[PDB]
Ligand binder design. Structure first.
Ligand SMILES: [Mg+2]
Ligand SMILES: [Mg+2]
Ligand SMILES: [Mg+2]
Ligand SMILES: [Mg+2]
Ligand SMILES: [Mg+2]
Ligand SMILES: [Mg+2]
Ligand SMILES: [Mg+2]
Ligand SMILES: [Mg+2]
Ligand SMILES: [Mg+2]
Ligand SMILES: [Mg+2]
Ligand SMILES: [Mg+2]
Ligand SMILES: [Mg+2]
Ligand SMILES: [Mg+2]
Ligand SMILES: [Mg+2]
Ligand SMILES: [Mg+2]
Ligand SMILES: [Mg+2]
Ligand SMILES: [Mg+2]
Ligand SMILES: [Mg+2]
Ligand SMILES: [Mg+2]
Ligand SMILES: [Mg+2]
Ligand SMILES: [Mg+2]
Ligand SMILES: [Mg+2]
Ligand SMILES: [Mg+2]
Ligand SMILES: [Mg+2]
Ligand SMILES: [Mg+2]
Ligand SMILES: [Mg+2]
Ligand SMILES: [Mg+2]
Ligand SMILES: [Mg+2]
Ligand SMILES: [Mg+2]
Ligand SMILES: [Mg+2]
Ligand SMILES: [Mg+2]
Ligand SMILES: [Mg+2]
Ligand SMILES: [Mg+2]
Ligand SMILES: [Mg+2]
Ligand SMILES: [Mg+2]
Ligand SMILES: [Mg+2]
Ligand SMILES: [Mg+2]
Ligand SMILES: [Mg+2]
Ligand SMILES: [Mg+2]
Ligand SMILES: [Mg+2]
Ligand SMILES: [Mg+2]
Ligand SMILES: [Mg+2]
Ligand SMILES: [Mg+2]
Ligand SMILES: [Mg+2]
Ligand SMILES: [Mg+2]
Ligand SMILES: [Mg+2]
Ligand SMILES: [Mg+2]
Ligand SMILES: [Mg+2]
Ligand SMILES: [Mg+2]
Ligand SMILES: [Mg+2]
Ligand SMILES: [Mg+2]
Ligand SMILES: [Mg+2]
Ligand SMILES: [Mg+2]
Ligand SMILES: [Mg+2]
Ligand SMILES: [Mg+2]
Ligand SMILES: [Mg+2]
Ligand SMILES: [Mg+2]
Ligand SMILES: [Mg+2]
Ligand SMILES: [Mg+2]
Ligand SMILES: [Mg+2]
Lengths: 60, 92, 101, 61
RNA sequence: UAGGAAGAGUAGUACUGCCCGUACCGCAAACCGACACAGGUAGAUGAGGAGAGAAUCCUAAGGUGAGCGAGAGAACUCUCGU
RNA sequence: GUAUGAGUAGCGAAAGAAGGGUGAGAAUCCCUUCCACCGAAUAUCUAAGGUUUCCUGAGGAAGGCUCGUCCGCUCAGGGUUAGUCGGGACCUAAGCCGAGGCCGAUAGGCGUAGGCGAUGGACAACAGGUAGAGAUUCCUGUACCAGUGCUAAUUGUUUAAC
RNA sequence: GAGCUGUACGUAAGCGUUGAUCCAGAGAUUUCCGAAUGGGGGAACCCACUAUCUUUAGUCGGAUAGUAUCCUUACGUGAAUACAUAGCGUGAGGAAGGCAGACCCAGGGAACUGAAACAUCUAAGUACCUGGAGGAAGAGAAAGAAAAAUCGAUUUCCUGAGUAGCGGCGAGCGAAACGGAAAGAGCCCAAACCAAGAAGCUUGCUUCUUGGGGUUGUAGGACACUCUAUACGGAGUUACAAAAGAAAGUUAUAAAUGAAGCGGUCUGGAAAGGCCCGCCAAAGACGGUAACAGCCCGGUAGUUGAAAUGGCUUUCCCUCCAGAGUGGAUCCUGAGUACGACGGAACACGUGAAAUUCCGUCGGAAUCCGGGAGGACCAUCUCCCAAGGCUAAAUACUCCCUAGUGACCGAUAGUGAACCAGUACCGUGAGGGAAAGGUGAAAAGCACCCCGGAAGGGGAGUGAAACAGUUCCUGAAACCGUGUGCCUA
């Protein structure tokens, strides 16, 4: 449930590399920030990413 | 249940018939019948006045008939005693 | 079964071949018929409440239906059975014409 | 039966069904004691009741 | 106390009170150990003489004679006595 | 599946004797007398656990480290009675579950209100009898706890009995 | 259409031509647990509240309905706080759980092993866990393939080909287009524009909803006009909008009829067999019957049959619908998007000269005088319009039902299980997991006598056979015995 409520981007998985290309396992998290926006007729605090928050959202 | 559904059949044995003169009657009742239901079931069928009811639960005996093992039915036995100023029940 | 209970019969095969008798019983669950005077057995019975004398008794035994052909009243011969309907009731007729059975 | 049962106006059939359970209890009473010789009456009394519960139920749909 | 309130106590009489367990073994041949196994199994009671004592020896109430025997009295092995 | 070891090891702590009885058959089953062992137990209750092993009448194929007429074995019938005993309809501890809620790739983790959960708290019955098997349960005698109806008196009715 | 009350042998009591048992379709009843849902709980148990009714003189009892949580939504109430929201209550829709140990889409994701060691690599996006489905899923109507000439949505099979490539350039991994086939099908939105309302009143504006119009690359549409047309015709519940209803035919689910040898004779317990004669055949499939049956039985070929329910096809009913050309002022054609830097992944392709696709984080376009691709990139040329959605068949699998087949097994084989098998037994538990088929054609399963408590025997009897007598067809070897011909202290 930790995901953006507008563009539902969230954690994904991938590899972590080094010299000699030893492969470990890691993850990529989204830049989720907790803000208070009008998600409905009333405001609420939800997870919103920093990229869906730079054009046209609400009070924040 | 009904009156005829709570009470199933009488018990006729050496112990059961040795107390008939004492105005005590032994029945097999429904497994899910309370002591109070048995009291009013008897008065509906035989029109006697009931003084006490005593109940007890019996398990099933493990029985064998050749390579096959199982249990008999579990029983609920009720003993009904009646007031002295009342009629009697004729097991006969 | 092509033979009912209580009709005359000729025995076609077996040790009692060529004889005749009535049908006293039928067992369609096993394809057997019991015919008087045919396939007698001597069973050694222990005395009991029924038949207190015990002894060795001559009693009939069932035989297979395929050893059995029905006999017609037209000529007294073993004939095959055909089925014909007269209105609402079906009847059995011999292949050799021979009216109804 | 059945066709004979259907000529009853859904109230006397309640009484006939009731009076059959009285017989069934008495029949079970004698079997336990050992005073019953026509044991075949047990099964046909039971089926007579079931024949009456069905007519009442289908009459009320 | 907040609240509810036209019914309330008293005496005498009669009646009402449901469900589950209850058998039997339980320092044991019936429980845990594959066994009718010299092992293990919480708690209450637990007498008399002598005695500080629930020690020790002999007994009371009560319970037992142990699920292979008899007969000889060698070596050797084990547990005891000089 | 069957041999050899081989009729060999073993037969699992312990004191028995005789006289009658039953029986086809007795060291081993029943009765009697004597003797011996335990006795802060090898005695009497009762939890856990086991589930019919309890009682009666028949039985001797298999089980019983021998024997068996016997048995905790086989067959067929029986046997467990509660307002007051222990538990529920009463209460909570450790712990567990947990509406909303907070976290988290999924699955889920944690947790408030709330609720379960005795090994503890509260709570009204005692003494006798019962010859096959049950007893604060059945029967006799005398009680207690909570409630209900009925009869007779008392009291009070909104400045308001209870 | 004549017996029946299952295995199950058999005792009793009964039921059936006023048509039972039996077979098929459709109904009714369906205890308790289990998502389990009134509360709780150690599985099949315990304890309730509300409304109505019923029983007793009343307490005690009984019957019938409702009462879980969450998502969407309608109404009524309603805090800090004046309006209002949160919250609270009631009414109506939906979900939950299972599995076929199979097929497939997504999230997460090993190691043993190979490289004759091992770390990049392989095993492998495999095993496994989780979620979502469907009878199929996924993909799918070109910002495509390709090159002096063109094709025209996806998918699957044959080739291309172990090729081009990738690779401690080691072990190894490994395409695609053209060509040949199976099957074939195309559509709907967003935006300009038009009509209607409401809100913010940014105050004569934008911005939200409803209906129409429109969806394409030789650019198309809007917009101006010419033409027809509002059911003349066309289409449809598998995409293209959606819900129903009749009739006819077919098919599935019980069934009916159905030819021809009792032929003679031999052996035999018994003839279907040998020998000698006949017949039927759209039927010489299979099985049974006392040994091997086209003509004994059930049947088979052929021809018939459905009250009731499901399926399919067609038609009717019903429902819904504008499509051609000419101009091009002016307007629209999917924005934090496409791309780029950094870190990863998928592409046969391991960062490499690395195009293409996707993810996380930052920066960040043009918009028809426009944009993308053709394996870095630039110019020309060619092909094509991304950042919205839907779509049948050709393909994969079998827990199942019907009809069949096999140079498949035949009781240590074949399923673990031909037999009351996931049973007995073993473990605290997850879990592991057997052995065990055959009397005889027919029980005709040994009346009776003798020894014995019995078991077990010897006669008698049934049977073709009892040296077939209740692990019972056949009955080998190990192993255990009795008698004896030759030898042996
Ligand atoms: Mg969160
Ligand atoms: Mg009780
Ligand atoms: Mg006791
Ligand atoms: Mg012993
Ligand atoms: Mg012991
Ligand atoms: Mg003490
Ligand atoms: Mg002492
Ligand atoms: Mg002293
Ligand atoms: Mg002391
Ligand atoms: Mg002593
Ligand atoms: Mg030796
Ligand atoms: Mg020796
Ligand atoms: Mg001993
Ligand atoms: Mg117990
Ligand atoms: Mg005993
Ligand atoms: Mg013995
Ligand atoms: Mg005896
Ligand atoms: Mg005995
Ligand atoms: Mg016993
Ligand atoms: Mg009492
Ligand atoms: Mg208590
Ligand atoms: Mg929750
Ligand atoms: Mg929790
Ligand atoms: Mg609490
Ligand atoms: Mg509790
Ligand atoms: Mg306690
Ligand atoms: Mg008390
Ligand atoms: Mg006792
Ligand atoms: Mg419930
Ligand atoms: Mg629950
Ligand atoms: Mg589901
Ligand atoms: Mg290696
Ligand atoms: Mg790989
Ligand atoms: Mg799954
Ligand atoms: Mg489906
Ligand atoms: Mg699809
Ligand atoms: Mg026919
Ligand atoms: Mg014919
Ligand atoms: Mg002959
Ligand atoms: Mg012949
Ligand atoms: Mg054949
Ligand atoms: Mg025949
Ligand atoms: Mg033969
Ligand atoms: Mg044969
Ligand atoms: Mg990069
Ligand atoms: Mg990006
Ligand atoms: Mg260009
Ligand atoms: Mg190319
Ligand atoms: Mg190029
Ligand atoms: Mg699609
Ligand atoms: Mg096998
Ligand atoms: Mg064999
Ligand atoms: Mg077990
Ligand atoms: Mg004999
Ligand atoms: Mg004998
Ligand atoms: Mg003989
Ligand atoms: Mg003979
Ligand atoms: Mg044979
Ligand atoms: Mg044999
Ligand atoms: Mg031999």
């Amino acid at each position: 449930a930790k995901e953006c409520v507008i563009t539902g981007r969230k954690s994904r998985s991938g590899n972590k590399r080094s010299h000699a290309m030893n492969s470990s396992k890691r993850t990529w998290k989204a830049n989720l920030q907790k803000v208070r926006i009008l998600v409905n007729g009333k405001p609420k605090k939800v997870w919103v990413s920093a990229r869906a928050l730079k054009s046209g959202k609400v009070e924040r | 249940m009904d009156a005829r559904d709570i009470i199933k059949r009488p018990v006729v044995t050496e112990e059961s018939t040795s107390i008939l003169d004492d105005k005590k009657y032994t029945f097999e009742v429904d497994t899910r019948a309370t002591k109070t239901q048995v009291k009013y079931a008897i008065e509906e069928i035989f029109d006697v006045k009931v003084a006490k009811v005593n109940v007890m639960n019996y398990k099933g005996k493990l029985k064998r008939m050749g390579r096959y093992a199982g249990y008999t039915n579990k029983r609920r036995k009720a003993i009904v005693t009646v007031t002295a100023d009342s009629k009697e029940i004729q097991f006969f | 079964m092509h033979v009912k209970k209580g009709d005359k019969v000729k025995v076609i095969t077996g040790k009692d071949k060529g004889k005749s008798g009535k049908v006293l019983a039928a067992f369609p669950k096993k394809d057997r018929v019991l015919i008087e005077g045919i396939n007698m057995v001597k069973k050694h019975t222990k005395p009991s409440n029924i038949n207190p004398q015990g002894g060795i008794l001559n009693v009939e035994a069932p035989i297979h239906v395929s050893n059995v052909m029905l006999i017609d009243p037209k000529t007294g011969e073993p004939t095959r059975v055909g089925y014909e309907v007269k209105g609402d009731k079906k009847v059995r007729v011999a292949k050799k014409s021979g009216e109804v059975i | 039966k059945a066709n004979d049962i259907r000529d009853l106006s859904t109230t006397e059939i309640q009484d006939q069904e009731k009076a059959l359970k009285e017989e069934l209890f008495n029949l079970r009473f004698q079997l336990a004691t050992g005073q019953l010789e026509n044991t075949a009456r047990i099964r046909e009394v039971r089926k007579a009741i079931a024949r009456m519960k069905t007519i009442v139920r289908e009459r009320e749909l």
